[PDB]
Design a protein around this ligand. Structure first.
Ligand SMILES: Nc1nc2c(ncn2[C@@H]2O[C@H](COP(=O)(O)OP(=O)(O)O)[C@@H](O)[C@H]2O)c(=O)[nH]1
Ligand SMILES: [Mg+2]
Length: 177
């Protein structure tokens, strides 16, 4: 465990537009500064000072469903992007169940479109309805980290937004046993 230092494969589940691919990109970049069948799959490896991460993001639902259903991925940690602009839409609900069956123990939720969402009243509201799916279908939903940034900003520059990706990394290290 000491070389890898604990090696963690963290699984990113969206609907179609939320920014996972984006979320996925941002995390690495942030990470670099601060520290440093047919199957279709996209892979990134990332490191916090504690854990080391392998990350999988799939261009499509079809991918998530097949990839999650067989064996592709193995996903200890599932990082979830629900985007404020919309709300949790089908692909998110589906992804949540599928996860439960899959045996995806931990889903950590990240809320993207806060480059576009001014409204504590909405956010709570995106944020509540997530909590509501998570439970009905699987998960705690209470004692479950919800992180709001905006991935797009974070790469792109400087920012407060960047900082949040840091919580995401942080929770990861914590939330995931
Ligand atoms: N404004 C804004 N747009 C975003 C953000 N993240 C992603 N997008 C944009 O929305 C489009 C779809 O996002 P994407 O990451 O590809 O979604 P995915 O299908 O879940 O992988 C992208 O081309 C991005 O330019 C974000 O945090 N803010
Ligand atoms: Mg994608």
């Amino acid at each position: 465990f000491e070389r890898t230092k604990p090696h963690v494969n963290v699984g990113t589940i969206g609907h179609v537009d939320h920014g996972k691919t984006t979320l996925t990109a941002a995390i690495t970049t942030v990470l670099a500064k601060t520290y440093g069948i047919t199957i279709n799959t996209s892979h990134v490896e990332y490191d916090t000072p504690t854990r080391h991460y392998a990350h999988v993001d799939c261009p499509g639902h079809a991918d998530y469903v097949k990839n999650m259903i067989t064996g592709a991925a193995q996903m200890d940690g599932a990082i979830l992007v629900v985007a404020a602009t919309d709300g949790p839409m089908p692909q998110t609900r589906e992804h949540i169940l599928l996860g439960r069956q899959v045996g995806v123990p931990y889903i950590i939720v990240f809320l993207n479109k806060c480059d576009m969402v001014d409204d504590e009243e909405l956010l709570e509201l995106v944020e509540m309805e997530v909590r509501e799916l998570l439970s009905q279908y699987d998960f705690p939903g209470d004692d479950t980290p919800i992180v709001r940034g905006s991935a797009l900003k974070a790469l792109e520059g400087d920012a407060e937004w960047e900082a949040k990706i840091l919580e995401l990394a942080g929770f990861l290290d914590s939330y995931i046993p």
